[PDB]
Design a protein around this ligand. Structure first.
Ligand SMILES: *[C@@H]1O[C@H](CO)[C@@H](O[C@@H]2O[C@H](CO)[C@@H](O[C@@H]3O[C@H](CO[C@H]4O[C@H](CO[C@H]5O[C@H](CO)[C@@H](O)[C@H](O)[C@@H]5O[C@H]5O[C@H](CO)[C@@H](O)[C@H](O)[C@@H]5O)[C@@H](O)[C@H](O[C@H]5O[C@H](CO)[C@@H](O)[C@H](O)[C@@H]5O)[C@@H]4O)[C@@H](O)[C@H](O[C@H]4O[C@H](CO)[C@@H](O)[C@H](O)[C@@H]4O)[C@@H]3O)[C@H](O)[C@H]2NC(C)=O)[C@H](O)[C@H]1NC(C)=O
Ligand SMILES: *[C@@H]1O[C@H](CO)[C@@H](O[C@@H]2O[C@H](CO)[C@@H](O[C@@H]3O[C@H](CO[C@H]4O[C@H](CO)[C@@H](O)[C@H](O)[C@@H]4O)[C@@H](O)[C@H](O[C@H]4O[C@H](CO)[C@@H](O)[C@H](O)[C@@H]4O)[C@@H]3O)[C@H](O)[C@H]2NC(C)=O)[C@H](O)[C@H]1NC(C)=O
Ligand SMILES: *[C@@H]1O[C@H](CO)[C@@H](O[C@@H]2O[C@H](CO)[C@@H](O)[C@H](O)[C@H]2NC(C)=O)[C@H](O)[C@H]1NC(C)=O
Ligand SMILES: *[C@@H]1O[C@H](CO)[C@@H](O)[C@H](O)[C@H]1NC(C)=O
Ligand SMILES: *[C@@H]1O[C@H](CO)[C@@H](O)[C@H](O)[C@H]1NC(C)=O
Lengths: 212, 77, 307, 202, 77
């Protein structure tokens, strides 16, 4: 079995530096080059760089030149990618992937990334999810302007499970996520009583409940 | 044309040679192999440099003489 | 006659002089792939040359192979009994130069020992196995006779015999496999002999074992005789590898093999040999340009450029 | 070397799926299950790696590679990327249920706190509509609307097996107070006639 | 000036090499090292000799041509 085990999730502050480690197992690290691929939450994969173990020559994207450094600790079969001068846009999952060619050629030109690590969620931001009501049938809660994606919305945590719809978050030119959760209500029940929606945002550590 | 055919007759055809990359450290024999390869590379680099310089010198001398001769003859005519 | 833009070359008496037309003499770029013609390339996937030689299970596809250049990938690994080759480089070099893994099985008469010994670290199929080109002789019943066998070389080609000595980890294992407390192996010919005294000692844990195999080779010239005399710890050969002479060689490169025509192969791929000098790599195979340190050498192909 | 491919392919289990990446210059096909590391499934250009069922296949024309999935099911549905270094835009594979229904349209006016923010984003919802192909257009005083509506569609319901969409568009407060009426219509495949629901700020 | 800058680009910088002086007698490896060093020394001595000869030849040819040209032009004037 060939396995790549990555570090734990990191929570940082803008302008700081983070170090993600990738521990290989089941093969010798110097036999394969190691590519690093990021994925902003819901933005598709983006190639970050490539470390050639056994000779240490690197190759990064121009977007990351200077602010990303990849090294290989051969003693522990570990590989480190450190990012300095973190920004808010760098919040993403990072994967280390195994590439074949180290000697003679740059591997990623001709070979795929056959084995991937589980990836670490490096989140450099914090933003509270602003909550707005949506009333006119149906009624909903609009969550707006929160950077890290994982956010859950319930209704009294035990009241509504049927008729509720959780639209996946959507981007914004400001780089902030927003979604909505609307539930149908009987026309009689809308004027008699209203419900309260609970929005939980672990990376921002924000738990806000709002009615209608 | 290529002009180097006369000096270097062809690309000589070598099949099996010594190791030129080593993983560990052996000692005497590895140092000897490294020294032999480095000596060969330095000598061939020097030979290439000198050959290019000589060919360039003779080519420019010849073309310069031809240009000057043709200029004189055309001017006289 | 003159041209608008010109190329700067170097002569005996000038660092830089502009000329009308100038060509390059150093091939400094490679296609990145190894052309599979005309040289008979053998791509070694996950198999080193020695592993295919010994008969590592996941290398069984390489039996009886021949090549003009054995490309040995950097991803290669061993997945059999942990072995060790004293003078590894020499054995690898001569096997690669021979250019064939053609193995002829010979009839060896091992009397009083249990042949086809195997281990769980080298799993062939579902069960325990061993190198396909070696024979692990263990005690039969409760005795281990002093094996003394011979094979004459009546053919007119060299024979290559690959044998080995088994170093056990513990004295208990030594006496359980070979009743002698400390045996030895002696493989000899008319002109030379080679004797090994197996030692007993724990070694770094590799693939679940502390014991090792030491792999030795013996070349029997035509008209010569092989005599194997052992009283324990012998990994006998099963036959001989047909040695040869040719233009065969080996190369360590991760470049992918490609369908094309090229004469010069470097670890960076196949390169054209039109230019006389190359800067790609100093390891070459075939009719290759001579390696030089310079990355550019301009040859003037025109008159001095006076615009 | 930009890579392009046709996104958001929707299909029920058990038929053909084709994705086409047009490399402009070795393209390999990776699959990312939701909340899981991407997995290689097409090496080289048409080779398959170990553990990948032979349902997947690749085909290369002159400069366009195409990945075909046969007899797909739940685990075959994920996001798919083509790689050559540069990645593809991504194509999502979603299950489809076989049931037809009409959209139910609601319009929700912006909240007052949203108004004081200055980004008066207003939302129109279409609940339990089928199929996926249902374009939605906003009418701004009976005029064309574009460049500001973000649409988000819920995946297939567990039992209802239908779709629900929400389109939100935001505008500066300096220009929001200038229209005062908005409509959200659907060019539904099931329903040819668009449904108009307007609201006046009063 | 020095004029050899073009042919020999610089003094290449060698740090660790083989042994070139031996106390005892070893055999094969010592003979190989002696042979390699002697081969290198002979080749470099020949290269130095030929390079000096070529540079001298071209320098004298050039200066002789310049002297003759200037004599002719001054005589004609
Ligand atoms: C054709 O293919 C060949 C084969 O791949 C290509 O050769 C490679 O080309 C690249 C790019 O030109 C070279 O990388 C450059 O290296 C310089 C300095 O390199 C020096 O060190 C090299 C590596 O040394 C490590 O590895 C060797 C072998 O494994 C080992 O013996 C050493 O001890 C050392 O080991 C250390 O690292 C290991 C891996 O992490 C650890 O395990 C270990 O513990 C040690 O920590 C060395 O190879 C190199 O050259 C030597 O060897 C060549 C023969 O290849 C020989 O000609 C030389 O004379 C030397 O003897 C040097 O000693 C590095 O500074 C460069 O960095 C540039 O770029 C970075 C960012 O990109 C910048 O930050 C830098 O400032 C700089 O601009 C670059 O990485 C590579 O060394 C070379 N060789 C190999 C084996 O890869 C060739 O390029 C191809 N050509 C074409 C046309 O395709
Ligand atoms: C002479 O001295 C040497 C060195 O001290 C001793 O060699 C050690 O011997 C012990 C047992 O005899 C070995 O222990 C075994 O190590 C195996 C390798 O473990 C490494 O790798 C795994 C991952 O594969 C790591 O998790 C682990 O931390 C190590 O890094 C283990 O796989 C073995 O486990 C088996 O046995 C244990 C016993 O409890 C079971 O629990 C397991 O389930 C499994 O069945 C075992 O732990 C050790 O590796 C040897 N070291 C070296 C360097 O070789 C000699 O034993 C000693 N001899 C004498 C006669 O004194
Ligand atoms: C300089 O000389 C080279 C060498 O012939 C010329 O390159 C060739 O040009 C012809 C044009 O008729 C092409 O058909 C060949 O394929 C070229 N060969 C190579 C190797 O490039 C080049 O055109 C000349 N340049 C000038 C300005 O005269
Ligand atoms: C050719 O000449 C132009 C100007 O006439 C110059 O800009 C250019 O660098 C020259 N070389 C090439 C290869 O175009
Ligand atoms: C290899 O070749 C020899 C003779 O050339 C033959 O006896 C043997 O059976 C062959 N082995 C395989 C696996 O083909």
């Amino acid at each position: 079995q060939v396995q790549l085990v990555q570090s734990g999730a990191e929570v940082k502050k803008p302008g700081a530096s983070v170090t993600v480690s990738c521990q290989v197992s089941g093969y010798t690290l110097t036999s394969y080059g190691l590519s690093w691929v990021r994925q902003a939450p819901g933005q598709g994969l983006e190639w970050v760089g490539w470390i050639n173990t056994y000779d240490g020559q690197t190759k990064y994207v121009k977007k990351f030149q200077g602010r990303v450094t990849m090294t290989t600790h051969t003693g522990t079969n570990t590989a480190y990618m450190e990012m300095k001068s973190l920004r808010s846009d760098d919040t993403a999952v990072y994967y280390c992937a195994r590439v074949e060619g180290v000697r003679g050629v740059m591997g990623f030109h001709y070979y795929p990334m056959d084995v991937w690590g589980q990836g670490t969620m490096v989140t450099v931001s914090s933003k509270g999810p602003s909550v707005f009501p949506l009333a006119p049938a149906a009624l909903g809660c609009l969550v707006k302007d929160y950077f890290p994606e994982p956010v859950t919305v319930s209704w009294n945590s035990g009241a509504l499970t049927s008729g509720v719809h959780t639209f996946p978050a959507v981007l914004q030119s400001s780089g902030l996520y927003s979604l909505s959760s609307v539930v149908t209500v009987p026309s009689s029940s809308l004027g008699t009583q209203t419900y309260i929606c609970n929005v939980n945002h672990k990376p921002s550590n924000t738990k806000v409940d709002k009615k209608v | 044309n290529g002009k180097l055919n006369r000096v270097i007759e062809k690309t000589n055809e070598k099949f099996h040679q010594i190791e030129k990359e080593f993983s560990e450290v052996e000692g005497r024999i590895q140092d000897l192999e490294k020294y032999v390869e480095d000596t060969k590379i330095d000598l061939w680099s020097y030979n290439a440099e000198l050959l290019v310089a000589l060919e360039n010198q003779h080519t420019i001398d010849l073309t310069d003489s031809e240009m000057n001769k043709l200029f004189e003859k055309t001017r006289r005519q | 006659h003159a041209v608008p833009n010109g190329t700067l070359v170097k002569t005996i008496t000038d660092d830089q002089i502009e000329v009308t037309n100038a060509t390059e003499l150093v091939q400094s770029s490679s296609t990145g792939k190894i052309c599979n013609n005309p040289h008979r390339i053998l791509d070694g996937i996950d198999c080193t040359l020695i592993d295919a030689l010994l008969g590592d299970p996941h290398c069984d596809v390489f039996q009886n192979e021949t090549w003009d250049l054995f490309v040995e990938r950097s991803k290669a690994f061993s997945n059999c009994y942990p072995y060790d080759v004293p003078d590894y480089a020499s054995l690898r070099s001569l096997v690669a130069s021979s250019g064939t893994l053609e193995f002829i099985t010979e009839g060896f008469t091992w009397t009083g020992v249990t042949q086809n010994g195997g281990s769980n670290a080298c799993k062939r199929g579902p069960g325990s196995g061993f190198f396909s080109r070696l024979n692990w002789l263990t005690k039969s019943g409760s005795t281990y006779p002093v094996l003394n066998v011979t094979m004459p070389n009546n053919d007119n080609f060299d024979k290559l015999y690959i044998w080995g000595v088994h170093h056990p980890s513990t004295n208990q294992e030594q006496t359980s496999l070979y009743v002698q407390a400390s045996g030895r192996v002696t493989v000899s010919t008319r002109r030379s002999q080679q004797t090994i005294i197996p030692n007993i000692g724990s070694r770094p844990w590799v693939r679940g074992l502390s014991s090792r195999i030491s792999i030795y080779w013996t070349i029997v010239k035509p008209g010569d005789v092989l005599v194997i005399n052992s009283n324990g710890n012998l990994i006998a050969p099963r036959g001989y590898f047909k040695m040869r002479t040719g233009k065969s060689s080996i190369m360590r490169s991760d470049a992918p093999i490609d369908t094309c025509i090229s004469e010069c192969i470097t670890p960076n791929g196949s390169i054209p040999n039109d230019k006389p000098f190359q800067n790609v790599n100093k390891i070459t195979y075939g009719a290759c340009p001579k390696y030089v340190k310079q990355n550019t050498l301009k040859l003037a192909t025109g008159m001095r450029n006076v615009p | 070397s930009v890579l392009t491919q046709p996104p958001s392919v929707s299909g029920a289990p058990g038929q053909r799926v084709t994705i086409s990446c047009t490399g402009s210059s070795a393209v390999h096909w990776y699959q990312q299950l939701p909340g899981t590391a991407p997995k290689l499934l097409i090496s080289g250009n048409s080779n398959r790696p170990s553990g990948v069922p032979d349902r997947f296949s690749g085909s290369k024309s002159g400069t366009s590679a195409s990945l075909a999935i046969t007899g797909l099911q739940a685990e075959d549905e994920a996001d798919y990327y083509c790689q050559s270094s540069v990645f593809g835009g991504g194509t999502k594979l979603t299950v489809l249920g076989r049931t037809v229904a009409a959209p139910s349209v609601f319009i929700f006016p912006p909240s007052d706190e949203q108004l004081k923010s200055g980004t008066a984003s207003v939302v129109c919802l279409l609940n339990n509509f089928y199929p996926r192909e249902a374009k939605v257009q906003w009418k701004v005083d009976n005029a064309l609307q574009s460049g500001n509506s973000q649409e988000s569609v819920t995946e297939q319901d567990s039992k209802d097996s239908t779709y629900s969409l929400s389109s939100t568009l935001t505008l500066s407060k300096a220009d929001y107070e200038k229209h005062k009426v908005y409509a959200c219509e659907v060019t539904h495949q099931g329903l040819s006639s668009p449904v108009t629901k307007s609201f006046n700020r009063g």
